[PDB]
UniProtKB/Swiss-Prot annotation, chain A:
Boundaries of the shown chain within the full protein: 983 to 1031 of 1273
Job description of the protein: Subunit of the fusion protein that is processed upon entry into the host cell. Mediates fusion of the virion and cellular membranes by functioning as a class I viral fusion protein. Contains a viral fusion peptide that is unmasked after S2 cleavage. This cleavage can occur at the cell membrane by host TMPRSS2 or during endocytosis by host CSTL. In either case, this triggers an extensive and irreversible conformational change that leads to fusion of the viral envelope with the cellular cytoplasmic membrane, releasing viral genomic RNA into the host cell cytoplasm.
Species of provenance: Severe acute respiratory syndrome coronavirus 2 (2019-nCoV)
Superkingdom per UniProt: Viruses
Protein name, as recorded: Spike protein S2'
Length: 49, 48
């Protein structure tokens, strides 16, 4: 629907939005993985002890 | 080169039109300067 010179602007907007979504998802996953690692360490200690 | 007076604006980078599409296309990331000036009295002929 648009010529390249202007469509680049829209594509850049979409790229920024989707990249931000990915970064948010990855940060959430990192924090959740920290929680799960704490829980798994507790579980391993409970098993051993 | 020499082109129509009203087609000068058609020469800018990332443009559309007969000239840009067919005979002289500038790249979107063109770097440089475009200089134009009427040459009616020096080029146009009384007889055409």
């Amino acid at each position: 629907r648009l010529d390249p010179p202007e469509a680049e602007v829209q594509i850049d907007r979409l790229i920024t939005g989707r990249l931000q979504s990915l970064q948010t998802y990855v940060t959430q996953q990192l924090i959740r993985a920290a929680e799960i690692r704490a829980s798994a360490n507790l579980a391993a200690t409970k098993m051993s002890e | 080169f020499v082109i129509r007076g009203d087609e000068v604006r058609q020469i800018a980078p990332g443009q559309t039109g007969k000239i840009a599409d067919y005979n002289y296309k500038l790249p979107d990331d063109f770097t440089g300067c475009v200089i134009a000036w009427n040459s009616n009295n020096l080029d146009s002929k009384v007889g055409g």
